[model samples]
Target: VHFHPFGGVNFYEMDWSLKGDLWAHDPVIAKEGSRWYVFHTGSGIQIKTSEDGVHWENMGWVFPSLPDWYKQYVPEKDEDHLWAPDICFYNGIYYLYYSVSTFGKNTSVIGLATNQTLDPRDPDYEWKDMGPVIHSTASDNYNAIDPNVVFDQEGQPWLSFGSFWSGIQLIQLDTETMKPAAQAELLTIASRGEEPNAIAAPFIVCRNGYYYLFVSFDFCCRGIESTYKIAVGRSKDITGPYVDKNGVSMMQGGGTILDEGNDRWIGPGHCAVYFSGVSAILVNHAYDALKNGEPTLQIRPLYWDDEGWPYLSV
Candidate 1:
């Protein structure tokens, strides 16, 4: 499977694999009943259950156990750390936002686990951890790790997290008690060129009235020398002064390059959009460097030209 376009961006390539060690990162394809659950981040929450996302079946550790206060603040070189994960289900229950902190250090934290039925055949479908909902304090850049929940038009419950020390942050939860509703809001969106603006992974989407903030700027995993790409901006205020397309205001760092450096795909960033009823579809993970470094899992099909902005169809 291939589909490249470049610069105008929209690249597709899928051979999706995971049978053992589970070397995947930040993926979150939903759809429950008819089956199609693909939540990732190796070693910790690695699930795969597609009825037909393209044939997959491996359901092991959703969170087998590790909450003695998260093994008592994880650090002995992290003990086996688990990063970037984002699962959501809400009403029926299945929240699983992760990130225990280590990469680039802010002593980050953002945990929580839930489960009603991600159904590994449901022997009571466990996962119920719910420990540290969020953390970060070295003075605070709001670096609580990458978690991404969404809801607004008044439905409330917003939670976009951060990375690279500090950048994208939003927190307004309480959609029937998912937690925080007041203390976290730091989304300047973009601005930090000259190297330190490593935006982290946030993927918000709200269309028409504007609130599209998809971020992931530099360095990810480093499979084959990952240079990471994926950027975006727009904000009618979901806590942002976000802008791009020249207005440049991701808090000053400015972003708009949707994906970067193409030929066979490089560091495509930790993304997740999947609307699929008629449009939107972009599940990311790239870093080929000729395979040996391998960090693959991509599926593209998302466009917005004439001017609405959003892109990915390379």
Candidate 2:
């Protein structure tokens, strides 16, 4: 289905013959000059650009070949295990953050890469790879994945990341260097019971005076059996003592259920928020059970009621 941003509450499915073979996840969109660039993870980090939001053309792989350090980290695996890449332009440089580790393993790390131009087609547009920005040792419980960079009202950059093993973690980052400036501070967003114990894929958005923290709860990547859904909490401070409608603190197991159901849209998480003027949208992906486990891109407009809590417009 093609996402129509201008018209609300509308969808039109495309023919199967028009579909491409790409399986994209963790989409990050950035506007550079007259073009919009969408960075996502397929085989590795892939790039696509569009003059308009609906139609896209492939721009090849951001990391066309895996680095030797990635191979050294996981020698047994033939293909590079890269996931959830986010790119942001800060100062005069573009910073790309990606996760490197096997799925379900707690030993994940977040790495940084820098480039001069948004267009990969530029002759001097080369990526300077900086090793690991955040790594987990035996002492840390959270798997380091889904790295997101957000600047506070003061314009200081901070990174929010984590999945599965622990919960979400936030750390101050050096804007000029794209590195952590302080020790990581953990933020407990949601938790699962002892069984699968899943709470991952965090995306934070701030509007008005409230800082909203969105996270996905339950299992993902299990084909038709996946039970993933999106949930959220809010706080006045950016560091978050975020809470839900029931007055349960997110740090102590309370979050508002934003999106879910038996609609066959499984595993809808790892989202990015896009804003143009006063209009805002949430872009995410859901596993299509009917397609034999293919993940399809999904977008929904974000709305706020009188009370100021945000929700997806179904």
Candidate 3:
């Protein structure tokens, strides 16, 4: 796939397939009608649209300005930026879950914004803030960011999110509220099992009677020095003791390596997966070594082994 100069930003014409505002970080993709949309970490949660899914153009931001309630949670947040948005079309509505937090702070909140339509030209085009869905503070072990919602085999929704602290967590979301239910228990799913516990960016999917949990390990956002890599584990249950291919627990730093960056694309991670029939694709951002470590969008075909593990090719 390729990106074009969306938003009129001057992007370096590189040899790689992607182009345009390739400055995307933590990209998540969704399709409505004939248009494909990308939502990533940026000011007002940047959005990009493509009719053919090859050439993309900047559409706009989800929020024109910072929400008034953001300052109440992230008091130190002085900018209008939002981070790591996850979008899903559920029950005839679009749910956008986004992050709001200062750098390296656990005082974070994952808020929900609902839209009747993604296209601005639609008659009901409007984003409604549904307030904080989940949150964490300084006293908590986990940072509340990078939200991904997945439905179980029975059609129950589960939210997985966390960063750079304890590990990834899962909570059942209420069907009507689209948030955690009353007295919902938070389940710790995956962790690095070491100090700093660098594991984060959890995305889950149920396939072949297994709940596959994908996550980014190590650091990100350091440009070329970023150590991020993609890993995966699986469990039979939604709330799980997920284990890698060798039967090593993800809580003990065990995961089957899916994709580490190459010389050109450094530290590929913070991924989202999509499936169409038997075909699947992985969407994420990688640092471009040839372009001064610019975070670039990557969309790669994902193939699965007979044993049900996902892998990317050269």
Candidate 4:
């Protein structure tokens, strides 16, 4: 159950047949020491691993028990369920940010966890819950979920997150704390500009001197009826007025369509992109039309056109 590993710009030619425990939602990936790891929303934030990037195996959950602090914000939250885990590696540590919230509510909190190593076999492999990094009350316009961390060219870390309530928001992080910097400005980076905005899942990546804002437009988690679609816009500046191919601002609901799932794979969204060498890979979850619309993991090599926009062949 091995797929050919690819390199360079020919990445799009790699095998997409993923085998093993592929159950996932809002999946994010990271690599360390010749191994691949994916962290996602589930009981205690589920984790999966792969030795060759094609054959995945269920590893375990990040938390053995629900963190007590989560109950303070989301009092009605379930005991073990967590949502939308994001993984990033910086300065010799793996930082995991996850969401705690009730369905369709603004009462949400994003918490952080850190680990010295991803390998459970390592002596230092223990996840340290760093507590809540940010939260949203019913009064706030934005919902704090689906966190994605991106470091600018200047080496500054910024957290981009939000859902339903007000689209997407961004804030800078302090290096020492790996949390929001004191008195940092919370900026609105993208929005749908309509009722029940239905836009969320922000994943940003820098390529070819521009920061690409990738977002999910429409509803997700409804299985077969989910209208989720992946869209993209880009800006030269990190804190942006991102625009689509036709130069319309993302704040005005402008984004170039990247993917709108076919009948076989219902509504696809909640994406993360990785750049290795000259190749790029896109990872996300899509409802399987053949399997009663089960949320399943999907990975594909991302190919860029002459205009620097990404497209998928199938």
Top-lDDT structure, candidate number: 4
Clashes of 2: 1
In model 1, the Cα lDDT at residue 47 comes to 73
Top TM-score prediction, candidate number: 4
Error of 4 at 30 (Å): 0.9
lDDT of 3 at 56: 80
Mark the regions of model 1 whose C-alpha exceeds 4 Å error after superposition. Answer: 1-37, 40-46, 54-58, 67-98, 101-138, 147-166, 169-231, 234-243, 252-280, 283-301, 306-308, 311-314
Query: Model 4, range 1-314, lDDT digits (tens) per residue?
Result: 00112233244556778999998899998777778888988999999999877899999999987788887888756557889998888777888999999889989999999999899999999999989999999999999999999887777888999998878999999988889976999999888888889789999888878999999999898889988999999999999989999999999889998998989998999999887666778899999999889999999988888999888765
Write one digit per residue (lDDT tens) for candidate 2, span 1-314: 01112233221221112133335566776766657677776555777776545666777777766666764444345655578888777766788888877766766678888888877667868888887888775467777788888776667777888777657777778766778855545555455433455677777767777778887777777776777778888888888788888878776557788777466777776777755445667777778767876666666667778898877765
| Candidate 3 CA-lDDT value | 0.86
- TM-scores for all candidates? 0.33, 0.86, 0.93, 0.95
Which is better, 2 or 3, measured by lDDT? 3
Error of 3 at 90 (Å): 0.9
Query: Model 4 Cα displacement at 20 (Å)?
Result: 1.0
Tens-digit lDDT track of model 3 for 1-314:
11111232212221226556667999998877777799999888999987756678888899887788887778856688899999887777889999999888889999999998889889999989889999998999889999999878787888999998889999999888899987999888899999989999999987789999999999899999999999999999888889999999999999998988889999999999877656667889999999999998998778888989988745
RMSD of 1: 18.4
Number of backbone-clashing residue pairs for each candidate, in the order shown? 15, 1, 2, 0
Off by over 4 Å in 3: 1-16
Better of 3 and 4 by TM-score: 4
